[PDB]
Amino acid sequence: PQITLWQRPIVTIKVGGQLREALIDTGADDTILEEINLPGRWKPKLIGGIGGFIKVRQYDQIPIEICGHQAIGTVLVGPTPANVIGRNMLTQIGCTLNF
Amino acid sequence: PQITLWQRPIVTIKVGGQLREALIDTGADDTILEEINLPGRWKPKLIGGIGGFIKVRQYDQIPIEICGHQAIGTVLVGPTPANVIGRNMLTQIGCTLNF
Ligand SMILES: CC(C)CN(C[C@@H](O)[C@H](Cc1cc(F)cc(F)c1)NC(=O)O[C@H]1[C@H]2CO[C@H]3OC[C@@H]1[C@H]3C2)S(=O)(=O)c1ccc2nc(NC3CC3)sc2c1
């Protein structure tokens, strides 16, 4: 699709067998999801944003469906106030900015 | 322009008579700039992101040039780790997401 920005650009994703809504976030380098049960090994990571840093679980090579497009990559799980799809996934689905 | 997301989508802005670089940030509702000297009245605001909240100065009806496009709107100034152009400005320059 084309998505305008009059509202938050929220899409449906499937990840870990579960359905969620997430923001298409061009200001996010990585993909960060609120607490969600994902399978397998992970590494603890501290990440920074507006207001300080959070501890996340890093999961690699996680398949995700983003508004009906398939991607695979790193997903960080932790106490984010919003589920965000970052550039690591957006590049795989061919997402661009236009003006 | 069209901007792909293999790198951070950084553009040149002019605001308050000053030149800066800023991220085109579809996950930002508002426009937030690092400490920068802007003229006139402001209101203190607390805003939230990944890792907690910051105190910002809110300035209204601020003209900004964003990669050669003119907009006017609210700019929040405070201790953001990155200058971000949010949807309040992106909608005015006709910025869309496409995949
Ligand atoms: C949903 C939030 C996460 C929104 N945010 C925008 C994201 O795009 C930020 C931008 C950013 C980029 C940076 F480089 C550094 C930063 F500090 C911030 N990015 C980020 O979280 O990225 C993180 C993580 C992603 O992976 C890596 O990439 C960079 C790092 C790193 C770890 S915001 O800044 O909190 C925000 C902006 C405006 C705004 N307006 C509001 N208005 C009121 C509600 C009406 S609320 C509000 C909130």
Side-chain angles (χ1 to χ4, degrees), chain A residues 8 23 25 27-30 32 47-50, chain B residues 8 23 25 27-30 32 48-49 81-82 84:
Chain A
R8 288 188 173 164
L23 246 195
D25 189 354
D29 300 329
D30 281 284
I32 315 183
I47 69 176
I50 246 190
Chain B
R8 288 188 173 164
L23 246 195
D25 189 354
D29 300 329
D30 281 284
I32 315 183
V84 298

Side-chain angles (χ1 to χ4, degrees), chain A residues 31-47:
Chain A
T31 295
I32 315 183
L33 305 178
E34 297 192 284
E35 189 54 53
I36 182 177
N37 176 35
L38 293 186
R41 301 184 50 81
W42 56 268
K43 292 159 157 62
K45 211 190 162 203
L46 293 185
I47 69 176

Side-chain angles (χ1 to χ4, degrees), chain A residues 39-91:
Chain A
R41 301 184 50 81
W42 56 268
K43 292 159 157 62
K45 211 190 162 203
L46 293 185
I47 69 176
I50 246 190
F53 74 90
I54 60 169
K55 192 163 194 283
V56 297
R57 313 195 295 278
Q58 175 173 342
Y59 293 87
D60 298 325
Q61 274 292 100
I62 297 303
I64 188 166
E65 185 180 12
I66 299 158
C67 194
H69 294 246
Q70 298 295 331
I72 187 163
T74 297
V75 173
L76 309 180
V77 180
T80 178
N83 292 321
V84 298
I85 309 307
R87 297 189 296 97
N88 70 309
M89 296 296 191
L90 294 176
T91 50

Side-chain angles (χ1 to χ4, degrees), chain A residues 7-36:
Chain A
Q7 299 288 334
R8 288 188 173 164
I10 296 172
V11 297
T12 304
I13 70 166
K14 188 177 168 178
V15 62
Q18 294 160 265
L19 308 179
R20 294 290 188 274
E21 296 184 280
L23 246 195
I24 297 292
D25 189 354
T26 60
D29 300 329
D30 281 284
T31 295
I32 315 183
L33 305 178
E34 297 192 284
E35 189 54 53
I36 182 177

Side-chain angles (χ1 to χ4, degrees), chain B residues 23-39:
Chain B
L23 246 195
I24 297 292
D25 189 354
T26 60
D29 300 329
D30 281 284
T31 295
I32 315 183
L33 305 178
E34 297 192 284
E35 189 54 53
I36 182 177
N37 176 35
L38 293 186

